[PDB]
């Protein structure tokens, strides 16, 4: 879309993007926890460093869910333009319409930016939020992503669940 991202950003510098995993030597160790009523979901293509689903959801083909995507950027990068850039992933969504840019935040004593709203997808209207953590570290700066996305009616359940995200995550160089 018009808004520049963060993806963006690393495409136009000399800046190399690795994909983490658990366990990976030299990486941040990230314990997000798993609120009650929602499920554990292994690293896999659909959720790169894991996520969570719920277990109630009113459509079981369409549950409202937080994926986690943890990221290694080496070389030429300002951990700051990592967070001006972040809301413009969401701001490019089809039909996105959120309360400005978002936030300023912070996740496990490290740096962050929020922002969520509303958008249609196959004339649906959905929730999504979008929490960046970037993690500066061994020679490199990680960048975490919270996104979390649900049909409009279950909104409620998603923000509970990122009040438990934002209260218990631990990040550890
Ligand atoms: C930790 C995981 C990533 C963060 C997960 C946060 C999940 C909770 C849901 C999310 O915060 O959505 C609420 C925010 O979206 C709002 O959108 C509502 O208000 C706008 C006003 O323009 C409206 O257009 C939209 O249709 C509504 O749903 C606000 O934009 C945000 O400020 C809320 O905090």
């Known amino acids: 879309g018009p ?3 963060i993806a963006d950003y690393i495409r136009d510098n000399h800046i190399q ?16 926890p798993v609120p009650d009523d929602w499920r554990l979901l292994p690293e ?6 894991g996520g969570i689903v719920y277990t109630q959801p009113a459509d079981p083909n369409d549950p409202p869910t937080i ?7 080496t070389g030429d990068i300002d951990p700051a333009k990592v967070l001006q850039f972040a809301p ?12 400005g840019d978002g936030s300023a ?12 709203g509303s958008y249609s997808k196959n004339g649906k209207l959905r929730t999504v939020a979008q ?20 049909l ?9 669940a990122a009040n438990v995200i934002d209260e218990q995550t631990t990040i550890t160089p």
């Open 152 to 160: 409009d009616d279950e909104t409620m359940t998603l923000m509970d």
């Open 3 to 5: 808004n520049y991202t």
């Open 88 to 99: 413009g992933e969401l701001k490019n969504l089809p039909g996105f319409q959120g309360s």
């Open 44 to 49: 896999s293509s659909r959720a790169p460093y």
């Open 67 to 73: 994926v986690a995507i943890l990221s290694k950027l």
């Open 17 to 32: 993007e690795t994909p983490v995993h658990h366990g990976d030597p030299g990486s941040p160790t990230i314990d997000l």
């Open 131 to 150: 929490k960046t953590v970037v993690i500066p570290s061994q020679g490199a700066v990680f960048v975490l992503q919270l996104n979390a996305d649900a």
């Open 105 to 116: 935040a912070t996740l496990g004593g490290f740096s962050a930016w929020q922002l969520g």
